């Protein structure tokens, strides 16, 4: 349906929020987390409605599983502010599990809780959340140290085998998010990466992302300022 749809650009603010939430659940299933998180967050501010009250719990519940997959691990504070902490509460445990990066904790917690999760629309995603936990463990092992033995890592994350650690590490490098080398024969992971953001072409990229979020904010502030006066101008005042 979505491929055939066209949303008007002159639709009102409630209409946009409802549309965006609903679209957000759909792209998240496809493997597009990046646009899915942004659409869900913006809907809540866009329209504070009395309709909106029924929606909010779902939006946050779905949103958190959706973030973990993108590759951000959300902080504690976010749970605290909307005072809906309790609704968020079973989710909060899944979060503490990713920051530690240990596999074993994730599977148990997610299962008992899983029954509740089915409701939001999370079930399809739920399986994939397994892989994020380890991905966070791999990033910490490579980044922190140079060489630590493969056996030390196997125990820490609670993988099934020392062998299992090799295969997972080997895949992660190809994706290129880790930026390390695993030496299979030598019995260790070597850190090829070094922590930097001024070295390569990259300080420019660092500026690029910072500037990029801004271009949208600027366009909105300026247009919005003009907007009550546009109606006064039409009402015939100079």
């Amino acid at each position: 349906l979505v491929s055939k749809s066209v949303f008007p650009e002159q639709a009102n603010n409630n209409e946009w929020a409802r549309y965006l939430y609903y679209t957000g659940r759909i792209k998240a299933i496809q493997l597009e987390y990046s646009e899915a998180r942004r659409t869900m967050t913006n809907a809540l501010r866009k329209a504070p409605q009395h309709t909106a009250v029924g929606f909010k719990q779902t939006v946050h519940k779905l949103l958190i599983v959706v973030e973990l997959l993108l590759g951000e691990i959300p902080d504690r504070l976010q749970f605290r502010q909307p005072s809906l902490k309790r609704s968020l509460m079973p989710y909060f445990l899944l979060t503490q599990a990713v920051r530690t990066g240990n596999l074993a904790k994730f599977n148990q917690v997610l299962d008992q809780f899983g029954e509740k999760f089915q409701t939001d629309g999370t079930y399809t995603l739920i399986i994939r959340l397994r892989h994020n936990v380890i991905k966070t463990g791999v990033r910490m092992i490579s980044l922190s140290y140079s060489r630590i033995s493969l056996a030390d890592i196997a125990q820490k994350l609670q993988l099934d085998s020392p062998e299992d650690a090799e295969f997972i590490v080997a895949k992660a490098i190809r994706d290129g998010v880790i930026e390390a080398s695993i030496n299979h024969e030598k019995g260790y992971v070597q850190s090829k990466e070094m922590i930097d953001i001024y070295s390569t072409r990259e300080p420019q990229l660092a500026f690029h992302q910072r500037i990029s979020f801004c271009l949208d904010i600027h366009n909105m502030s300026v247009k919005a300022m003009r907007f009550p006066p546009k109606s006064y101008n039409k009402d015939l005042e100079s």
Binding site: R76, Q96, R99
Partner: peptide
């Protein structure tokens, strides 16, 4: 993040005493 404070106070005092004996 995670709550490092509860765990560190108990671990730091106890572990350190065994470590004294184990290593320099």
């Amino acid at each position: 993040n995670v709550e490092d404070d509860f765990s560190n106070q108990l671990r730091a005092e106890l572990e350190k005493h065994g470590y004294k004996m184990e290593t320099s």
